[PDB]
Amino acid sequence: MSGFSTEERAAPFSLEYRVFLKNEKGQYISPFHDIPIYADKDVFHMVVEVPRWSNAKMEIATKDPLNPIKQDVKKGKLRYVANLFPYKGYIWNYGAIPQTWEDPGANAAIAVCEIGSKVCARGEIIGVKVLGILADWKVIAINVDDPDAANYNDINDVKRLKPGYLEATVDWFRRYKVPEFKDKDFAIDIIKSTHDHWKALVTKKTNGKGISCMNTTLSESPFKCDPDAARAIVDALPPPCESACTVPTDVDKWFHHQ
C-alpha cells in the first residue's frame, strides 16, 4: 500500500551506503521534503530510519542532496547505539515525520518512536496515529496498519495496553549517551509548528543552517530541481550491493546500570 520504495547504493554498513527514496512513479525524491506530512486524515507519514531492535545509527542526511538515509559517523567510524541492559538496540521503530523542521532546535525533522508490533524496514514509509510526545521532542505513534491500532488513541492507551513501554522509553533516552509525556493534541500542536518552520525553510523565508533543500516535487519551492537531472545524484554512486558488511562484534556488548 505504500507508494514509495528505496534505492540502496553500496553495501549496508559501509561508509558509502546510502538509501534514497522513490515515489510511485520511480522518481527519486527527498524523504525530508518530498513525502507529504499527512498520509490521510489524522494519519501522519513516518520515514522509518531504524528498525526496532537494530543498532546501526542511521538517519536522514539533512545536509546531503536528496537527503538519503545514511549511517552516522564520528572520527571516521560508523556509529551504532549501545545495547543498554535490558534492551536490544532501539526499542522502537525510530524515524522522523517528513516536512517538519526543528528550527535551531535539533536542526532536523521531528523524531518519532513508533510502538507497533511490526518491525519496519530502513527507509520504509508508513502511516502513524500520533498518541503523545516526550520533551528535544520524541513523538509517540503507532503504525495505522497495526492489527491493534484502533485500541490506541491517546497516550494513556500505551500505559494501558503496553505497560512499561513509556518508562523504558524515558530510561533509554536518559542512559543513551552514557557510553513527562504530553498527550495527542499537544503532540499534534508541536508537530504542526515544526511543519510551519519547515515551510519557511523550503520557501527560503529563513536561513537553512546548511540543510540541503533540493527536492523534486515541491512546485512552490525555489529549491525544486528537475527529476531527471536529480537522478545523477544516485546514479553516480556505487551500484546496489546485496552482501552487507560485517558489524563489529563490539556492538553486541550489553551495558549494565550500576
- The alpha carbon of residue 90 and the mean position of all alpha carbons in its chain are separated, in whole angstroms, by 12
- In DSSP terms, 257 is beta-bridged to none
The set of residues, in sequence order, having a beta carbon less than 8 Å from that of 120 and lying 6+ positions away, is 48, 51, 52, 93, 114, 126, 143
Phi, psi torsion values for 23, nearest 5 degrees: -85, -170
- For this PDB entry, the determination method is X-ray
Residue type, 217: T
The domain ranges of the chain are 36-211
CA distance 46 to 165: 20
Residue 101: C-alpha distances to residues 39, 50, 56, 107, 208 (Å): 18, 19, 23, 6, 10
- Check whether 136 is labelled as a binding-site residue: yes
Q: Residues, the chain, total? A: 258
- In DSSP terms, 142 is beta-bridged to 129
Residue type, 109: A
Phi, psi torsion values for 201, nearest 5 degrees: -65, -50
CA distance 37 to 98: 5
For residues 213 and 202, is the Cβ–Cβ distance under 8 A? yes
CA distance 8 to 240: 5
CA distance 74 to 209: 20
- Between strands 83-84 and 73-74, the pairing is unpaired
Whether residue 86 is preceded by a cis peptide bond, meaning omega within 30 degrees of 0, is yes
For residues 225 and 234, is the Cβ–Cβ distance under 8 A? no
The set of residues, in sequence order, having a beta carbon less than 8 Å from that of 244 and lying 6+ positions away, is 11, 12, 13
For the chain, breaks with the C atom over 2.5 A from the next N come after 104, 135, 179
- Between strands 77-78 and 83-84, the pairing is unpaired
Q: Taking Cα atoms as reference points, which of 96, 109, 127 lies closest to residue 1?
A: 127
CA distance 107 to 96: 12
- The CATH number of the domain covering residues in 36-211: 3.90.80.10
36 CB-contact burial (10 Å; exposed 0-12 / middle 13-18 / buried 19+): exposed
Residue type, 1: M
Torsion sign across C-alpha atoms 182, 184, 189, 192: positive
For residues 66 and 28, is the Cβ–Cβ distance under 8 A? yes
Q: Taking Cα atoms as reference points, which of 231, 217, 195, 196 lies closest to residue 34?
A: 217
CA distance 38 to 43: 6
Q: DSSP string covering the chain, please?
A: --S-EEEEES-TTSTT-EEEEE-TTS-EE-TTTTS-SEEETTEEEEEEEE-TT--B-EEE-TTSTT--EEE-EETTEE-B--EETT--S-SSEEEE-TT-------SSPPEEEE--SSPPPTT-EEEEEEEEEE---EEEEEETTSTTGGG--SHHHHHHHSTTHHHHHHHHHHHTT---EEEHHHHHHHHHHHHHHHHHHHTTSS--TT----BSS-TT-TTB--HHHHHHHHHTSPPP-SSPPPPPGGGG-EE---
Q: What is the resolution of this structure in A?
A: 1.7
CA distance 25 to 111: 27
Cell of 175: 542512559
Residue 102: C-alpha distances to residues 62, 65, 115 (Å): 12, 19, 22
